[PDB]
Amino acid sequence: SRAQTMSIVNCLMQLRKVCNHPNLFEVRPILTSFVLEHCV
Amino acid sequence: VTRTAAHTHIKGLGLDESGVAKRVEGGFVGQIEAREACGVIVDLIKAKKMSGRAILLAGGPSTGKTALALAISQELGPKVPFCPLVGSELYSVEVKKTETLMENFRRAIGLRIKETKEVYEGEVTELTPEDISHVIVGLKSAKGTKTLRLDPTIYESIQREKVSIGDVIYIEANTGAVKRVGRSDAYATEFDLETEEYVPLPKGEVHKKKEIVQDVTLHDLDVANARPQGGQDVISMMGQLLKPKKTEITEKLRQEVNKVVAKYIDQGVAELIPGVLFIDEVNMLDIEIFTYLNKALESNIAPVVVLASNRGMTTVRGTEDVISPHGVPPDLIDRLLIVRTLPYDKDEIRTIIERRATVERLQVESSALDLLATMGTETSLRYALQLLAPCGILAQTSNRKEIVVNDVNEAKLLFLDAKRSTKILE
Amino acid sequence: TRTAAHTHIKGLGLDESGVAKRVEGGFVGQIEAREACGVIVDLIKAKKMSGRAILLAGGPSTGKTALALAISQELGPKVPFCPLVGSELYSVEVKKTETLMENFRRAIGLRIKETKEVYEGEVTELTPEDAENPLGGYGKTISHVIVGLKSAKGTKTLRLDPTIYESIQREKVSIGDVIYIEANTGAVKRVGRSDAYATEFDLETEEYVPLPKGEVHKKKEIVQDVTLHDLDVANARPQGGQDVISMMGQLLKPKKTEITEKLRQEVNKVVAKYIDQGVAELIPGVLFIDEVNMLDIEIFTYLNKALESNIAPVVVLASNRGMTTVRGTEDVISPHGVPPDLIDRLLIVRTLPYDKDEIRTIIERRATVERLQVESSALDLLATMGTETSLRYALQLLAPCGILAQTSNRKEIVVNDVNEAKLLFLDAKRSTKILE
Amino acid sequence: SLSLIAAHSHITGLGLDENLQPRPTSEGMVGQLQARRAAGVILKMVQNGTIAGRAVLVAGPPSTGKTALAMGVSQSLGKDVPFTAIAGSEIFSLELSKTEALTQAFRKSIGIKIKEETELIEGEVVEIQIDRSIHKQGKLTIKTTDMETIYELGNKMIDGLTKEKVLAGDVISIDKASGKITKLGRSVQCPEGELQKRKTVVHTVSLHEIDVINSRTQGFLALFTGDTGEIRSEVRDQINTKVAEWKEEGKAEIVPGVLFIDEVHMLDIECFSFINRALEDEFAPIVMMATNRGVSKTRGTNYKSPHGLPLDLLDRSIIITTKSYNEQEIKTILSIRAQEEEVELSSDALDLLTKTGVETSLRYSSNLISVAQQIAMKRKNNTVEVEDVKRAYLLFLDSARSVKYVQENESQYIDDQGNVQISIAK
Amino acid sequence: LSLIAAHSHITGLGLDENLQPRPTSEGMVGQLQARRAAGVILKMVQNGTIAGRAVLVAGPPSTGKTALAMGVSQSLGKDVPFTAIAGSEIFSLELSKTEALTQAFRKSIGIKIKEETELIEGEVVEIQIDRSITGGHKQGKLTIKTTDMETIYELGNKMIDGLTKEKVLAGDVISIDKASGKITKLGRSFARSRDYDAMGADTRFVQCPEGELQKRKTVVHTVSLHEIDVINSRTQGFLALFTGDTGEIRSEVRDQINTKVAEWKEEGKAEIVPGVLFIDEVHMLDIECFSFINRALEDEFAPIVMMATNRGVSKTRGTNYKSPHGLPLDLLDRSIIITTKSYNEQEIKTILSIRAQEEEVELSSDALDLLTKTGVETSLRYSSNLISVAQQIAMKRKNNTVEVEDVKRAYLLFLDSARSVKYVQENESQYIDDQGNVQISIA
DNA sequence: AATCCCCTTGGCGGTTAAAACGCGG
Ligand SMILES: Nc1ncnc2c1ncn2[C@@H]1O[C@H](COP(=O)(O)OP(=O)(O)OP(O)(O)=S)[C@@H](O)[C@H]1O
Ligand SMILES: Nc1ncnc2c1ncn2[C@@H]1O[C@H](COP(=O)(O)OP(=O)(O)O)[C@@H](O)[C@H]1O
Ligand SMILES: Nc1ncnc2c1ncn2[C@@H]1O[C@H](COP(=O)(O)OP(=O)(O)O)[C@@H](O)[C@H]1O
Ligand SMILES: Nc1ncnc2c1ncn2[C@@H]1O[C@H](COP(=O)(O)OP(=O)(O)O)[C@@H](O)[C@H]1O
Ligand SMILES: [Mg+2]
Ligand SMILES: [Mg+2]
Ligand SMILES: [Mg+2]
Ligand SMILES: [Mg+2]
């Protein structure tokens, strides 16, 4: 959808990266607790 | 594939841009005025300006109050915090009813914050204690190596994780959490049989930094500042196994937490998302809960509490001579705006039954559906709604897909209504 | 200074022969009640009888609490006096009976004296010595340690046990630090650094303290007044121990527990032994329970047993209601809301209502103690108002009258100020009328 | 202190002149001339501090300004003076006796100011030189706007700086006595003068805070966790006698405050019996009690009472009575509320709101402003006109209309006997 | 571990392929309408699509409502959770009524996570562990054989420690889990070379395993939703799974668990198997419990609740008004009621015969007829209880069959409710009355 | 006014030419 309208070849490479694996863009997060700077 | 519940067909209020409600949209049929009022309330919540506003969804049984509340939640979206509740849930045994009500108040107020996470990961190449002493660890990765100095708590975490040279770890600097993810691939063939589960050597640099946005509630901050909550150290274990039960959080902690949140918002690192607290069957509350709810609504940081009741001219629980419009004492009623919910005629009952059948993947013949609608009119709408599944089961047992009149009659003869059972008792 | 409701009450105001003056000690009238309270005060000072009980019976605003506080003032601050109200017995941690018993033993004071010898000063030397022969001891084979302490009057060289040396090492004491050794227990405390070495470093975190006065070796006699309940609490929840379990227990909340009769018996045994040896002396105090009406029948029944004990203070009770059904009972109408069996163990001291002259004198004294000037006409108006509605209404209306007079920059309260105060602040009867 | 809009945000004071005469409309308060005059008398008594153990009852019909009066008193009293506001339903706890809860509330409203004189050096660090044993030799240099000198460290200061790991070029603060180090960013800000300054820090605490601090080994956490427990009376006596001694010495001053119980008609007879005696003793704050019921049965008793309170307590209190508003005062209160809520009402809209509030309730008309604003925004209109308020009236019901609807359709609601006719037919 | 109990004689609902109740099958007799309705509810549970339905079983005492519930549970079988609770169980001291009901509701939803594990199985040939005295280095190799293959594995430290702990020898057939690391001793292959101690304790030989030495197997972990909630509530919640003292789990934990389990289902990691919650004598529950049940049935993760009641019109607990079934109209509106009827003489006779078969009591025809007449006259449960006592009386007589005289003796020795009431009314002075008066003396 | 050379860009893989380098003496 973004490539339908930028350059086209970089979008084709990104599409190939999609076809390879989604982790090439962003890995699923390692969830961890929020840390407060200092207690009351 | 999918499961069906009481309000699975309710996808929203079905209100257009101008605010007028279509007759049948979002799974709703009729109830136009209540849908419009709830849309106005949703707009008020989205404004994020007022605090402590309260409304009452007043109507008879099987009229569409809980459905309206769930529709408000759907319209607002998953970003905002919507806390469902029942009047019977506030009668705790660990802490008093007031504390539970306040905790639910602060659970319905949302906060979205930005935090930078410092993360280290790599294959261990050295474990040298500095001498309870600091440990000097050397982490190697595919792009570089790094040597770090860790506090004694992290040393205790590493010690209890059985981390040796050649192990791959994951130290989160902000929280001090150490996870042994496995043994390095370079040592996979060292032995032909051992319990070790091997992992590849991490890619990228050892020191990684990412910015994540996480949604928390004020109750989460209160619990964090009140009692210890996590950790891999024995000190944390003893701290949390000591004083395990809930405690009556004081106003001072809430005020300090509010100051902290104000500082966070002022710095721009956080944004506030006030939400909704839904208390269904409000008539179960005692007079003390209502009395404290009067004071709690006057707080400058409070959610838009929505209340639902199906009682009229009923006496208030706890009191012995106070007759109230809906079981709610007049002091709280003056703080509320009442949205009246109206019964359903035959045509709307028929359409509701049709849509419920469509949702549960059932096929109902027009004559059978008319009989089901007329028996729902005669006895109850919910009774007609629950008869659909037995009818479908009976039809399937006869190798027939669509529901017929005979299956409905058989289901009626098998399962009875309240009036019929009472008549049998007589 | 702050002016409470009973600040003007300084004493019972009696003569040497026991007769009560008409106006003395802040009291106005109440001659018979004051004389009875004086006899009771003499009985308390006698320190011979246990479990004696009196009940102050009278109407609201008559002076029951005033008489109780006068008794407390007359006895002095060296004799226990534990105030209470009937509602405070209903705890949520332990049974009401245990709370009543704890209050009973909180009013039997004990004066225990102990002679203590302390070595204090600034450390000048620390020369540990080993045994003359290596075979003499085990391992380190550490013999005595020699420490030199300096005081304002000179120096002394002490010879200490190796245990004291271990304590010195634990407290991290170096040369020049002011220390404190108790020969009674062998405990070493680090007071701080001497002011002599204050300017050794221009930036250092050390609590610099002056050199101790007097000799290095000072023997002092320490006297403390402790209740028996203090000993019971000390035994029930001792503070000793440095284990992990000990510290974890220290962090836990101190919930009240039903201290067994065995612990009380053992405490009484040790206290009796010390009283026989002359180390300690017994001071029976007074227990005051205001609003006795709020006690349950179970509390009264347990009081029957408590008052028969060998160690029991003089319980003084106040009740402001008559012919009232006892709480916790359906049918037992009782004289003062107090069960008949407890009444049979009591001596009732009746207190009588006031007339206009007494109310006027009370308002005068209250205005004087409040640092307020009141005109005679406004004072007569206040007296008429008080005899019309209540004494406490006037006594509490005095202060807003003073504030109103100050807002007009007037040194004294005028009748107009009292009238404006009446208009601004209502009373119970007028509030009932306006709400009807 | 960032927070949303409450129902008492506009009341910024009691609106009195020098002679304690309240103005018609000032500091957000309208009308209630005698009530505000009496409240000013109470405020002057609180500020004087020479009067202890006074109870004032704020009685009157609902929606008259009792809580507004208390809020105005609190704001005019300002900070640096305790003001504890607890609802009468907060006393009933499963961990604290009602007498203990009332005692803790009483102690919370008496403040103690303790001055601590600390010697702290503040400046911009330049160089730090630490060497091994030759126990430790160290020199630090602190630069300010007009001095630059080196300091010869000792053992403990070196250990503390190593523990903090202070860098160079960052503003640092070191305390000579305590030894605490407070870090600050690089010099927006800059050192302003001499290296070592003499500034006193004042700590404001309450008697309850001291009691809880001395209650356990680490009792000051209970001020936030709320697990204080029933403190021993000997501890409180110790605190009281030490406060008397400190005041005599002049090293600490007492700031008496105000305790506000919003819903005293919920406390039982034991609580009132306790209050009667707790008022008499010294260190007793000024107790403000708000009640509305004319004559009711005191909780825990089977007899009526002139305000729901026993006659013994009413004898000890002075009563401030509030009177119902009229049309003009309703109009100006609604104007103030609309200005606070950032809503631009028209003249005819304000008149309609005023007539609705006079006919039904002030709170109902106050709540309709925001709903009317949201209705107008759906029409893309800035000012709220009459038709928006009329639509808000139609969509949201008040107490009287809801009662009328319930009475005219009593069959479709659940009654006190538990009967309802869910079936729309028959 | 079980004994002959009241409902031990029923193994299911006894239905055909078209849900038509058989006259007598799987232990149940009669109740054709009730059994057909129970079968419909059974199919509804087995479908797994309909959520949060409520069903009520009403009827006179001894009409088989608890028997119907046990039949439904038996037809469900294992792998489908069934939580049988009483109305008295909710009222706890450490948890609230709403919390106890929440835990009971979540106990009926099961989560299954299937995992594939690699297992090494074979008969040991040689084990050799070399360890240095006063040294931490250990080196070992083993030879594990199968009928078609044999191989040698050189072992890491943890495997050496595990095998040393398990006391593995040559004549041992053992299994090794490469992931968990546990060693299970399945049996022995031959004797231990005739040493003195343990001479003949290994006679029970086991056959050598056959096939690939390292084979993959699947393991299914079934855990209820409540167990997951308790595990994730606190760090010590795992102990709370056995000890109790779970506390009141915060709502955020339950919401997060719901979201995570929904994600697991959408990912195929976990399979959700909803079950049935059964409340005995629901009339003991408070009105607050009924309100919470009303709301909690609308959740998507809710089971199917079935309740038993026989009170007719009665006062709902917590309120002062009578209700049609001891339940408020709000709960009756959202529940389908299945009814039970009194039993004929023939149905009673065949139930008695079924019970006699289950209790292994051989009744003569005349004895069975007398028992049936007694049961019709007095109670079904009375005759059911009399069967075993009659068997014991017959054994005392040294007879292998129960005759009419044994039943007569059992009837004489043990009384029914009516006879006891009559004897009390005739001799009222010998019993303590409601006013607390009784005559102890006989003169 | 319709058509050629280079552009135009991610991630790849070669592949020399300085950077920065112990050490030998
Ligand atoms: N107007 C409507 N359109 C579509 N579905 C509706 C409508 N009103 C009710 N329902 C559905 O019918 C059922 C009625 O239940 P509710 O909406 O909760 O009624 P209720 O007012 O909550 O009754 P109570 O007070 O909970 S007993 C639910 O499954 C609703 O989703
Ligand atoms: N004899 C007296 N002389 C002076 N003041 C008195 C006397 N008796 C009572 N008072 C005053 O009247 C007030 C009511 O006294 P108190 O004993 O508290 O009431 P009650 O007797 O109802 O308990 C007190 O403030 C006290 O100062
Ligand atoms: N004198 C006043 N001046 C300004 N606003 C008032 C006044 N009295 C009442 N209000 C407004 O009316 C609303 C309700 O008053 P409230 O404090 O609830 O009185 P009560 O507690 O007696 O019902 C408050 O939001 C307040 O802003
Ligand atoms: N339809 C039936 N088929 C077989 N046995 C039955 C049937 N109904 C009742 N019973 C037997 O009779 C007894 C009745 O017990 P129960 O079902 O608890 O009675 P209730 O229905 O009053 O709860 C049970 O022991 C059961 O084995
Ligand atoms: Mg509902
Ligand atoms: Mg008194
Ligand atoms: Mg109010
Ligand atoms: Mg049963």
The pocket of ion ligand 7, defined by CB under 5 A, consists of: D 67
End-to-end CA distance of chain A: 49
Q: Got the DSSP string for C254-302? A: -------HHHHHHHHHHHHHHHHHTSEEEEE-EEEEE-GGGS-HHHHHH
- Pairing relationship of beta strands D170-175 and B304-309 according to DSSP bridges: unpaired
CA distance D192 to E377: 105
- Distance from the CA of C128 to the center of ligand 1, in angstroms? 88
Read off the amino acid at residue C150. Answer: K
Instruction: Please state the residue numbers annotated as binding site of E for ATP.
Output: 59-66
- DSSP per residue over D40-69, as a string? HHHHHHHHH--B-S-EEEEE--SSSSHHHH
> CA of B147 and C1' of F18: distance in angstroms?
29
Measured in whole angstroms, how far is the alpha carbon of residue B271 from the centre of its chain?
20
B274, B279, B283, B288 alpha-carbon torsion, rounded to 10°? -50
Q: Straight-line distance from CA D136 to C1' F23, in Å?
A: 37
State both tokens at E120: 């090494």
Assess whether the C-beta atom of D357 lies below 6 angstroms from ligand 3. no
Assign residue D384 the CATH number of its domain: 1.10.8.60
Residue pair E339/B416 in contact (Cβ under 8 Å)? The answer is yes
* Segment B154-158 long-range contacts (CB within 8 Å, at least 24 positions apart): B154/B178, B155/B129, B156/B232, B156/B233, B156/B234, B157/B232, B157/B233, B158/B127
Q: Give the residue from chain B lying closest to C244, CA to CA.
A: B238
Q: Give DSSP secondary structure letters for D325-346.
A: --HHHHHHHHHHHHHHTT--B-
Residues B328, B329, B333, CA angle at the centre, nearest 5°? 75
Instruction: State the smallest CA–CA distance between residue B174 and chain A in angstroms.
Output: 7
To test the contact with chain D by mutation, choose from B15, B255, B298 the residue with the greatest count of D C-beta atoms within 10 A, namely B298
* Maximum Cα–Cα distance across chain B: 87
Pairing of strands B54-59, B177-184: unpaired
**Which is the closest atom of ligand 4 to the Cα of E57?**
21
Q: The tokens of C69 are what?
A: 């506080």
Give the contacts of B169 (CB within 8 A, at least 6 positions apart).
B121, B122, B124, B137, B139, B158, B161, B163, B178, B179, B180, B181
User: If DSSP codes are grouped into helix, strand and coil, which group holds residue B274?
Assistant: strand
Exposure class string for B123-156: b at 16+ Cβ within 10 A, else e: bbeebeeeeeebbebbbbbeeeeeebebeebbbb
Q: Which residues of E touch B422 (CB under 8 A)?
A: 313, 324-325
Cα–Cα distance for residue pair D382/B33, rounded to 1 Å = 24
How many Å lie between the alpha carbon of E313 and the closest alpha carbon of chain B?
8
Interface residue A36 vs chain B (CB under 8 A):
yes
Alpha helices in D56-172 (DSSP H): 66-77, 98-108, 155-164
- Compute the distance between CA of residue D142 and CA of residue D168 in angstroms, rounded to an integer: 10
* Contact flag, residue A13 CB and nucleic strand F, below 7 A: yes
Neighbours of C172 (CB within 10 A): 8
Question: Cα-flanking dihedrals φ and ψ of residue A7, to 5°?
Answer: -90, 165
Cα dihedral C60, C63, C68, C71 in deg (nearest 10) = -170
Q: Is B301 helix (H, G, I), strand (E, B) or coil?
A: coil
Query: Residue D119 Cα, ligand 3 centroid: separation in angstroms?
Result: 49
Residue B238 in contact with partner chain C when CB distance is under 8 A: yes
Query: End-to-end CA distance of chain C, in Å?
Result: 41
Give, in order, the Cα–Cα distances in Å from B217 to each of B117, B226, C161, D41, E390: 20, 14, 60, 42, 68
3-state class (DSSP) for residue E245: coil
Phi and psi angles of residue B144, each rounded to the nearest 5 degrees, phi first: 180, 175
Rounded CA–C1' distance between C246 and F16, in angstroms: 73
**B260 near A CB under 8 A:** yes
Give ion ligand 8 contacts, CB < 5 A.
E 66
Give me C199's structure tokens.
């300017």
H or E element at residue B128: strand B109-129
Taken in order E344, E346, E350, E355, is the CA torsion positive or negative? positive
Q: Report whether B147 contacts B165 (CB < 8 A).
A: no
Q: Which two tokens stand for residue E127?
A: 């084990």
* Any atom of ligand 4 within 6 Å of the Cβ of E108: no
B76, B82 Cβ separation under 8 angstroms:
yes
Q: Residue D418: closest CA among chain E residues belongs to which residue?
A: E321
The structure's method of determination equals cryo-EM
- Say whether B51 and D6 touch across the interface (CB within 8 A): yes
Task: Report the SS3 class of residue D406.
Answer: helix
Q: Is E424 helix (H, G, I), strand (E, B) or coil?
A: helix
Q: Where are the alpha helices (DSSP H) in E92-236?
A: 97-106, 157-166, 225-233
Domain encompassing residue D187: 115-201
Beta bridge partners of E155: B193, E140
Residue E302 C-alpha to ligand 5 middle, in angstroms?
Answer: 16
Could you count the other beta carbons within 10 Å of the beta carbon of residue D321?
20
HSE at residue D333, side-chain half, CA atoms within 13 A, is 30
R_g over Cα of chain B? 29
**Count of C-beta atoms within a 10 Å radius of residue B192:** 14
Protein residue with its CA nearest to atom 19 in ligand 4? E62
CA distance B292 to D93: 13
Instruction: Quote the radius of gyration of chain A (alpha carbons, Å).
Output: 18
In sequence order, the 6+-apart residues with CB closer than 8 A to the CB of E29 are E23, E347, E350, E351, E354
Coil/strand/helix, residue D356: helix
- C388: Cβ contacts below 8 Å, ≥ 6 apart: none
Say whether B195 and E159 touch across the interface (CB within 8 A): yes
Nearest Cα to Cα of residue C157 among C173, C174, C143, C144:
C144
- B304-309/B276-280 β-pairing: parallel
CB under 8 Å to D207, separation ≥6 — which residues? Answer: D107, D108, D110, D112, D239, D240, D243, D283
Q: Which residues pair with D116 in a beta bridge?
A: D201
Q: What angle do CA D90, D93, D99 make, to 5 degrees?
A: 85
Count how many pairs of residues, chain B against chain C, have C-beta atoms within 8 Å: 5
Which residue on chain B is closest to E265 by alpha carbon? B1
- Please say whether the beta carbons of C53 and C307 come within 8 A: yes
* Structural contact between residues B193 and E153, judged by C-beta atoms closer than 8 angstroms: yes
Residue that is written with structure tokens 């838009």 in the block: B304
Residue D365: CB within 6 Å of ligand 3? no
Q: What span, in angstroms and rounded, lies between the C-alpha atoms of D88 and D91? A: 6
- Closest CA to ligand 1's atom 14: B62
Task: Identify whether the C-beta of residue D261 lies closer than 8 Å to the C-beta of residue D87.
Answer: yes
- Look at the block and give the residue holding tokens 């601090």: D213
Q: Which ligand is nearest to the CA of C5?
A: 2
**Which residues touch E347 (CB under 8 Å, ≥6 apart)?**
E29, E30
Q: What are phi and psi of C109, to 5 degrees?
A: -80, 150
Residue nearest to atom 8 of ligand 3 (CA): D65
Q: Whose CA is nearest to atom 18 of ligand 4?
A: E66
Question: Does ligand 4 lie within 6 Å of residue E7's CB atom?
Answer: yes
Judged by CB atoms closer than 8 Å, whether chains meet at B416 and E299 is answered as no
CA of C355 from ligand 5 middle (Å) equals: 65
A7 in contact with nucleic chain F (CB within 7 A): yes
In the three-class reduction of DSSP (H, G, I as helix; E, B as strand; rest coil), residue C100 is classed as: helix
The C-alpha atoms of residue E56 and residue E280 are separated, in whole angstroms, by 11
Residue D195 sits in a domain of what CATH number?
A: 2.40.50.360
Helix, coil or strand: residue D85: strand
Chain length of chain C: 436
Chain position carrying tokens 């004198």: C361
The alpha carbon of residue E302 is apart from the nearest alpha carbon of chain B, in Å, by 9
At D56, list the tokens: 């004032």
Task: Give dist(CA B138, CA B124) in Å, integer.
Answer: 6
Residue D64 alpha carbon, nearest atom of ligand 3: 22
